[PDB]
């Protein structure tokens, strides 16, 4: 194998998580102070997910500084699934608002928003518990990887369709929309693809000395995930003037 590993000191895996957690708490409080619209409500879910990741790694980076560790694994898997599902949910809400522009306020009330959020979070938690409880490898890992890839494809397709509609509207009356789409898709890919690629290599090509060089820096691939937890509250929450100072 390509050397052994490249492990960084736990001095880096603490401050980022606490910063993300405090940011998420702050934005949740800011939204809840007033903003009784579905869209902002969806961001609320995302916010929670982000801070959960911190805890999801907090205990993970605390117990290593010393079934006593399956609960934390369930926590972190549920956090990841909840975050990805919240991203899909906010994208779907934006698509529905853009395309069904007149019946949106007649078919999506607060009750349905609450029902959907509750169902999504319950499903994420139970799915994480099932994944970590009675599976070792090659049994549910395939399901998780396929779920992530399908969700990425769906989100990208929705955003590209919205961009095409925007270009069509421009043609009847260019770069900023392309820039926004590029930054969103690129940040999602850069933040999340390496971890699942390492997961796929963990099953397909264990030894495979070409793949061995890829797994030599797993902690590195993890830090990018931390970046996501501090990018989502800045890209979505910190772009609407109403939420900025409320």
């Amino acid at each position, epitope marked *: 194998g390509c050397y052994e590993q490249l492990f960084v000191s736990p001095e880096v895996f603490v401050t980022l998580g606490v910063i993300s957690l405090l940011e998420n708490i702050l934005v949740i409080v800011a939204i809840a102070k007033n903003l009784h619209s579905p869209m902002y409500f969806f961001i609320c879910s995302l916010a929670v997910a982000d801070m959960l990741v911190s805890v999801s790694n907090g205990s993970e980076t605390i117990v*290593i500084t*010393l079934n006593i*560790d399956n609960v934390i694994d369930s926590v972190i*898997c549920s956090s990841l699934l909840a975050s990805i599902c919240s991203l899909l949910s906010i994208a779907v809400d934006r698509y529905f608002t853009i395309f069904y522009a007149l019946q949106y306020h007649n078919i999506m009330t607060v009750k349905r928003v609450g029902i959907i959020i509750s169902c999504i979070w319950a499903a994420c938690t139970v799915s994480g518990i099932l994944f970590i409880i009675y599976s070792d490898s090659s049994a549910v890992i395939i399901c998780l990887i396929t779920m992530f890839f399908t969700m990425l494809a769906l989100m990208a397709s929705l955003y590209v369709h919205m961009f095409l509609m925007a270009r069509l509207h421009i043609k009847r009356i260019n770069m900023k929309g392309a820039i926004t789409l590029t930054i969103l898709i690129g940040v999602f890919v850069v933040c999340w693809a390496p971890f699942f690629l390492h997961l796929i290599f963990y099953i397909s090509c264990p030894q495979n000395p070409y793949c061995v060089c890829f*797994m030599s820096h797993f902690n590195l691939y993890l830090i990018l995930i931390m970046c996501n937890s501090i990018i989502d509250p800045l890209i979505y929450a910190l772009r609407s003037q109403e939420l900025r100072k409320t």
Partner: nanobody, 85 residues
Framework: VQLVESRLSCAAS????????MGWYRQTPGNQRALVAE???????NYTISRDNAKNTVHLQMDTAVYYC?????????????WGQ
């Protein structure tokens, strides 16, 4: 979690809770690509490998006197495998 080594034995010394699979991957042209000897907590063996309780220990009763030690964690949320000498 570096694995120290010394009819072979290997004791897992590191901040690890319960290593899932520990075994041997001895071969000439890099890695083994085929587990010559491995064990697990459940006791299933794929090829006499000795492992009492978990104990993070490996003993094999059983080319040259150069081999590789294997260790991998089945926790799906943090896939990571170590190596030895």
């Amino acid at each position: 979690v570096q694995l120290v080594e010394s009819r072979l034995s290997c004791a897992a010394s590191g901040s690890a809770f319960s290593l899932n699979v520990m075994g041997w991957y001895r071969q000439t042209p890099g890695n083994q690509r085929a587990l010559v000897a491995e064990i697990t907590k459940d006791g299933s063996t794929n090829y006499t490998i000795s492992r009492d309780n978990a104990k993070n220990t490996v003993h094999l009763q059983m080319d040259t006197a150069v081999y590789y030690c294997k260790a991998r964690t089945g926790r799906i949320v943090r896939p990571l495998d170590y190596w030895g000498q």
